[PDB]
From a paper:
Despite the co-crystallization experiments were performed with GalNAc-T2, UDP and Mn+2, we obtained binary complexes with glycopeptides MUC5AC-Cys13 and MUC5AC-3-13 (the binary complexes are referred to the enzyme complexed to the different glycopeptides MUC5AC-Cys13 and MUC5AC-3-13, respectively), and a ternary complex with MUC5AC-13 (the ternary complex is referred to the enzyme bound to UDP and the glycopeptide MUC5AC-13). Interestingly, MUC5AC-13 was bound to an active form of GalNAc-T2, whereas MUC5AC-Cys13 and MUC5AC-3-13 were unpredictably trapped bound to the inactive form of GalNAc-T2. In these cases, the flexible loop was found in an open conformation, different from the one previously described for the GalNAc-T2-UDP complex (PDB entry 2FFV14 and root-mean-square deviation (RMSD) of 4.68 Å for aligned Cα atoms corresponding to the flexible loop; Fig. 1c,d), which further demonstrates the loop versatility. MUC5AC-13 as well as MUC5AC-Cys13 and MUC5AC-3-13 glycopeptides have a C-terminal GalNAc moiety that establishes interactions with the lectin domain-binding site. Although the N-terminal of MUC5AC-13 is covered by the flexible loop, the N-termini of MUC5AC-Cys13 and MUC5AC-3-13 are exposed to the solvent and inserted into the sugar nucleotide-binding site. The latter two glycopeptides adopt very similar binding modes, although some differences stand out towards the N-terminus (RMSD of 0.72 Å for aligned Cα atoms corresponding to residues Gly1-Ser5). The Gly1–Ser5 interactions with GalNAc-T2 are mainly governed by common hydrogen bonds with Glu334, Arg362 and Lys363, and distinct ones in particular for Asp224 and Tyr367. For the diglycosylated peptide, an unprecedented GalNAc-binding site, formed by aromatic residues such as Phe280, Tyr367 and Phe377, is found.
In metazoans, this post-translational modification is initiated by a large family (20 in humans) of polypeptide N-acetylgalactosaminyltransferases (GalNAc-Ts), which transfer a GalNAc residue from uridine diphosphate N-acetylgalactosamine (UDP-GalNAc) to Ser/Thr side chains in the presence of manganese. GalNAc-T isoforms contain an N-terminal catalytic domain adopting a GT-A fold and a unique C-terminal lectin domain, classified as a carbohydrate-binding module (CBM) 13 in the CAZy database, with a β-trefoil fold that are connected through a short flexible linker. A key structural feature of these enzymes in catalysis is the existence of a flexible loop formed by residues Arg362 to Ser373 (residue numbers in GalNcAc-T2) that adopts different conformations during the catalytic cycle and renders the enzyme catalytically inactive or active. Here we present the first crystal structures of the inactivated and activated forms of the GalNAc-T2 isoform in binary and ternary complexes with different GalNAc-glycopeptides enabling us to study in detail the lectin-mediated modulatory mechanism of catalysis.
Numbering used by the authors:
A (entry chain B): 0 to 15
B (entry chain A): 75 to 569
Write the structure that this text describes.
């Protein structure tokens, strides 16, 4: 075999 | 010798259904009750850009051997992966599907699928891990091109041809679909933002990076162009079989735990190939993490063997930024690496500095005299400018691991610095809010130090500590140093 648990594709909800 | 439409899914899932009272998430960290409700060939939306429908492919694209490794997968999800490959791929392009059962508890999970047209099952007699299992499957593969998929995926319309077209044209391209989301709770299939690609921080776990303004501008210019990427997560990709072999397969000394992103991504780029995301290829994946791995914690140790094996071979002196982020890894045994160092030499690979400058210049490297670096963390919150400028307050905000307003360094001059702004003690009375002001080299108001095993931040020359107790009332303050949760702060890298 298995992959490690993969992170849902997301990022910050604001802009730098 | 059963065609996939004639496979009896009901009998296969069978007695492995969740009993009322059993945790639906126990078998594999997604809701097996919802997975078992779906048909093996369930319809999914076509998430491709409309321009992807206007493509035609030659019939002589090279066939692939699809290698799927698994360990205790939910039967319904494993079957649906296999069926999606068979249903959505031109059959001539599927030489075989090789299932590598990595010592699952019940051998029947794999064996019963071996009755399906094109499906061959190899069972390991002990748990070998993904990378060793993939080498077994690749060694068995009859085709000229390898496709690696995970065991809880669903291929979309014309997913395969775009990947094969890239590799047939240039064997040094290692290519991946855009990975769509199959929700871990309700199993809906959806697309994520197009402006994300793979990346990593110095802790060396895979993350999604938000594209830079330049990358986003480029993408808008052609949303179906192949996208170069510095890192794949390692679950889904296509690679010419001879190139896979020539470049050193996978390191057979890797164990079960993690790092499947790292070694292959660094080796492919440093040794003259490239990684790509192909937007017209879509494969859904059941992402299983809420929150992606956080440090400190045990993950640093759990993934350390495989991570150190990559870092010690490929990263040159930059490995020390990994150990600054993951000090628990520093003394974890990782095995002898002489064979892989010999491979690196034989292949004439470029140094890691070349990788950082040419492949991943977005990864911020500490200044050579920085004392500490990265984010300044308190629980799951991070020191954050809140988008303020000079004269503004600073705050705490949930850590998003996207840099930006959460990017800081403790400099040689003892300042806590973001761009050209520094944390400034404008008022020494306890309880006073601190402010962002332009960095000035000998401003004593801007000097800070790590204390108590790098767990707090004290203003130099004082008994004042950075404190979030004032966050609701306006921002971070200086407060008399004391044994308070709200005075705990730790940089992600201590240098
Ligand atoms: C799972 O976690 C490991 C930790 O070493 C890597 O980040 C790997 O890339 C992850 N796998 C997937 C498929 O996301
Ligand atoms: C977006 O703005 C918020 C405050 O509104 C935070 O400062 C956050 O850290 C910002 N995101 C990034 C990526 O900098």
């Amino acid at each position: 075999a298995g992959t490690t648990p993969s992170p849902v594709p997301t990022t910050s909800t604001t802009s730098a | 010798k059963v065609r996939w439409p004639d496979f009896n899914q009901e009998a296969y899932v069978g007695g492995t259904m969740v009993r009322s009272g059993q945790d639906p998430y126990a078998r594999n960290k997604f809701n097996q009750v919802e997975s078992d409700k779906l048909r093996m060939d369930r319809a999914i939306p076509d998430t491709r850009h409309d321009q992807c429908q206007r493509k035609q492919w030659r019939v002589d694209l090279p066939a692939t051997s699809v290698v799927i490794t698994f360990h205790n997968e939910a039967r319904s999800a494993l079957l649906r992966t296999v069926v999606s490959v068979l249903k959505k791929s031109p059959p001539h392009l599927i030489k075989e599907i090789i299932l590598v059962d990595d010592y699952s508890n019940d051998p029947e999970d794999g064996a019963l699928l071996g009755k399906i047209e094109k499906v061959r099952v190899l069972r390991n007699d002990r748990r070998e891990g993904l990378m060793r299992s993939r080498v077994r499957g690749a060694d068995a593969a009859q085709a000229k091109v390898l496709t690696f998929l995970d065991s809880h995926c669903e291929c979309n319309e014309h997913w395969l041809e775009p990947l094969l077209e890239r590799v047939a044209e240039d064997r040094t391209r290692v290519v991946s679909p855009i990975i769509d989301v199959i929700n871990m709770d309700n199993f809906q299939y959806v697309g994520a933002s197009a402006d994300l690609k793979g990346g990593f921080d110095w802790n060396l776990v895979f993350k999604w990076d938000y594209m830079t303004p330049e990358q986003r501008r480029s993408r808008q210019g052609n949303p179906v162009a192949p996208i170069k990427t510095p890192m794949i997560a390692g679950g889904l990709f296509v690679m010419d079989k001879f190139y896979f072999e020539e470049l050193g397969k996978y390191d057979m000394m890797m164990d079960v735990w993690g790092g499947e992103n790292l070694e292959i991504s660094f080796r492919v780029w440093q040794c003259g190939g490239s990684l790509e995301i192909i937007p017209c290829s879509r494969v859904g994946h059941v992402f299983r993490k809420q929150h992606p791995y956080t440090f400190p914690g045990g993950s640093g140790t759990v993934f350390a063997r495989n991570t150190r094996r990559a870092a010690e071979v490929w990263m040159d002196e930059y490995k020390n930024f990994y150990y600054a982020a993951v000090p628990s890894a520093r003394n974890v045994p990782y095995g002898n690496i002489q064979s892989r160092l010999e491979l690196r030499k034989k292949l004439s690979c470029k140094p890691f500095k070349w990788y950082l400058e040419n492949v991943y210049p977005e990864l911020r490297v500490p200044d050579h005299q920085d004392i500490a670096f990265g984010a300044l963390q308190q629980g799951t919150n991070c020191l954050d400018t809140l988008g303020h400028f000079a004269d503004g307050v600073v705050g705490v905000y949930e850590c998003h691991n996207a840099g930006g307003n959460q990017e800081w360094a403790l400099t040689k001059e003892k300042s806590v610095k973001h761009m050209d702004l520094c944390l400034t003690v404008v008022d020494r009375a306890p309880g006073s809010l601190i402010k962002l002001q332009g960095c000035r080299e000998d401003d004593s108001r801007q000097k800070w130090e790590q204390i108590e095993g790098n767990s707090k931040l004290r203003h130099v020359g004082s008994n004042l500590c950075l404190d979030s107790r004032t966050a609701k009332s306006g921002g971070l303050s200086v407060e008399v140093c004391g044994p308070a949760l709200s005075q705990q702060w730790k940089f992600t890298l201590n240098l």
